Design an enzyme around this catalytic site. Structure first.
Site, PDB file in Angstrom:
ATOM      1  N   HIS A  61       0.754  -1.290   0.143  1.00 11.82           N
ATOM      2  CA  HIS A  61      -0.066   0.005   0.013  1.00 11.82           C
ATOM      3  C   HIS A  61       0.850   1.201  -0.072  1.00 11.82           C
ATOM      4  O   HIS A  61       0.440   2.139  -0.818  1.00 11.82           O
ATOM      5  CB  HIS A  61      -1.046   0.277   1.082  1.00 11.82           C
ATOM      6  N   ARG A 172      -4.662 -17.651 -19.246  1.00 18.05           N
ATOM      7  CA  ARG A 172      -3.803 -16.553 -19.789  1.00 18.05           C
ATOM      8  C   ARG A 172      -2.446 -17.196 -20.084  1.00 18.05           C
ATOM      9  O   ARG A 172      -1.625 -17.113 -21.174  1.00 18.05           O
ATOM     10  CB  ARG A 172      -3.849 -15.257 -19.472  1.00 18.05           C
ATOM     11  N   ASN A 173      -1.970 -17.822 -18.898  1.00 15.70           N
ATOM     12  CA  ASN A 173      -0.633 -18.537 -18.702  1.00 15.70           C
ATOM     13  C   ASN A 173      -0.543 -19.416 -19.933  1.00 15.70           C
ATOM     14  O   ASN A 173       0.358 -19.688 -20.481  1.00 15.70           O
ATOM     15  CB  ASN A 173      -0.285 -18.855 -17.603  1.00 15.70           C
ATOM     16  N   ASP A 199      -2.186 -27.239 -22.660  1.00 11.19           N
ATOM     17  CA  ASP A 199      -1.425 -26.541 -23.654  1.00 11.19           C
ATOM     18  C   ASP A 199      -0.462 -27.324 -24.490  1.00 11.19           C
ATOM     19  O   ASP A 199       0.231 -28.438 -24.016  1.00 11.19           O
ATOM     20  CB  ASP A 199      -0.880 -25.255 -23.122  1.00 11.19           C
TER      21      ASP A 199
END
Ligand SMILES: Nc1ncnc2c1ncn2[C@@H]1O[C@H](COP(=O)(O)OP(=O)(O)O)[C@@H](O)[C@H]1O
Lengths: 268, 256
Positions: A61, A172-173, A199
């Site tokens: 933060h 996405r990987n 994949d």
């Protein structure tokens, strides 16, 4: 009955579910001192882990805010000046740091806080959008995405953005490392949903597969590529799913690349 | 009894003793799967806590490198172009982030050195050296150190270098901001050790006392707070009777 209770409670805590088992405070006769000391242990452990996790959230933060002011400054440069070569360096590094901070914030949002604001959601309703966006992304890369089995109206309980991001990161990987094809398969039984992402890309060695969910993961063959974030994605996936009482596994894909398995329990 | 074995094992782990695998796998056939799954839980917890520490020890390293490339980019702009107003803005924020990262780097060097196996140590054995080095440092500054009550052979469990550095930081801080005197007082009871560090320096406002353990305001007292809190203890910042800042550390006692 009492050994079964303590075994299941120890196996639960071992996965990352640091929550009180009142079930050990109902144990016949003498397993009440053992059960109560076990719950005392859980409370102590939770208090011990949240301290380091808090430090992480506070740093995250504190780092976040000046980076936003920096990103504003660069945007105002692109206004006064044009497309420079130096701007192409500054904005690139600004985005790299941005993603890193955001991912640090997320990993301090998940595992750290019990403050999880959870809700009841259905699997299809939750991940349909992610699967459609992933299908578009595949189409744009000249790659194929095949959903062997779609998610159905299967009941789940937890943070929707967390699970959305958990699957989004996995797919996405898989889109990144694949060569031509990606496969997503859903499966449900009485106990829970099992998502499998395959994949056809380059395989991952059994050594690397075991330490792929590491915060900053030294990947061989993908460090040479330098075409991603910092490796916080998969560690976010793991912490997000583990806090959702589930688990994640990394195996060798039948497509030839990497197989990623997510398991989440059903809400009752 | 098997319930007594599991109770003593759970009460040990509750004190931070992951660094031990009791023999819960030698008795009735039913309590063997529970005992073996309990030891698997201990290993998993140890593996989970060293990973959390590794994350903080790596953040500094991971964030440093692109920020340097960014600082290079801005430097090259002051070379090809003049001193724009926007560059002054980006460089201001870049320096803010720079100092923060450098301080985080210092935190990962101190974590890399102090990083060890938590173990059973006695209070006097642990901090005597720190108190003596602090006494020498006080003498060299022309300041006075008075140990109102010394630490005794009181049992503690945890990382010795971590607690050593926690007290070292508190006392060194009190040496820095004091005017002439610093006082260190130990106190024990059945539950735990209470260390009180006072200085005659300038007082800290009640607003600042609550946000003194904030990360960025060269690690900061944030490390002290997180290190003592991970040691199942606590830290408090009050107004000192000497006139400056009072720092209270509390740590629980170890029991076999
Ligand atoms: N004994 C004290 N007397 C006065 N001010 C103090 C004392 N201890 C801490 N402070 C204040 O608390 C701030 C935060 O503490 P710290 O994290 O140790 O900062 P620093 O990096 O300068 O050592 C310091 O900047 C200082 O002004």
């Amino acid at each position: 009955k009492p050994a079964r209770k303590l075994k299941n409670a120890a196996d639960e805590v071992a996965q990352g579910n640091l929550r009180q088992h009142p079930e050990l405070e109902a144990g016949p006769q003498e397993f009440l001192a053992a059960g109560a000391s076990f719950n005392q242990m859980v409370t102590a452990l939770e208090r011990m882990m949240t301290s380091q996790q808090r430090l992480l959230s506070d740093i995250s933060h504190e780092l976040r805010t000046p980076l936003t002011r920096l990103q504003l400054g660069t945007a105002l440069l692109r206004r006064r000046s044009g497309e420079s070569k130096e701007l192409e360096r500054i904005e690139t590094e600004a985005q790299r740091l941005d993603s890193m901070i955001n991912d640090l914030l997320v990993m301090s949002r998940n595992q750290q806080k019990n403050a999880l604001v959870s809700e009841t959601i259905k699997a299809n309703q939750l991940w349909s959008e992610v699967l459609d966006n992933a299908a578009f992304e595949a189409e744009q890369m000249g790659k194929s995405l095949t959903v062997n089995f779609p998610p159905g109206p299967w009941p789940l309980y937890g943070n929707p953005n967390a699970l959305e991001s958990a699957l989004e990161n996995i797919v996405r990987n898989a889109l990144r490392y694949s060569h031509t094809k990606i496969e997503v398969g859903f499966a449900v039984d009485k106990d829970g949903i099992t998502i499998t992402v395959d994949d056809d890309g380059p395989g991952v060695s059994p050594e690397d597969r075991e330490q792929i969910f590491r915060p900053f993961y030294r990947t061989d063959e993908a460090r040479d590529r330098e075409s991603g974030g910092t490796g916080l994605g998969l560690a976010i996936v793991e912490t997000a799913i583990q806090q959702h009482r589930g688990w994640v596994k990394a195996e060798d894909s039948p497509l030839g690349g990497l197989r990623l398995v997510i398991w989440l329990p059903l809400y009752k």
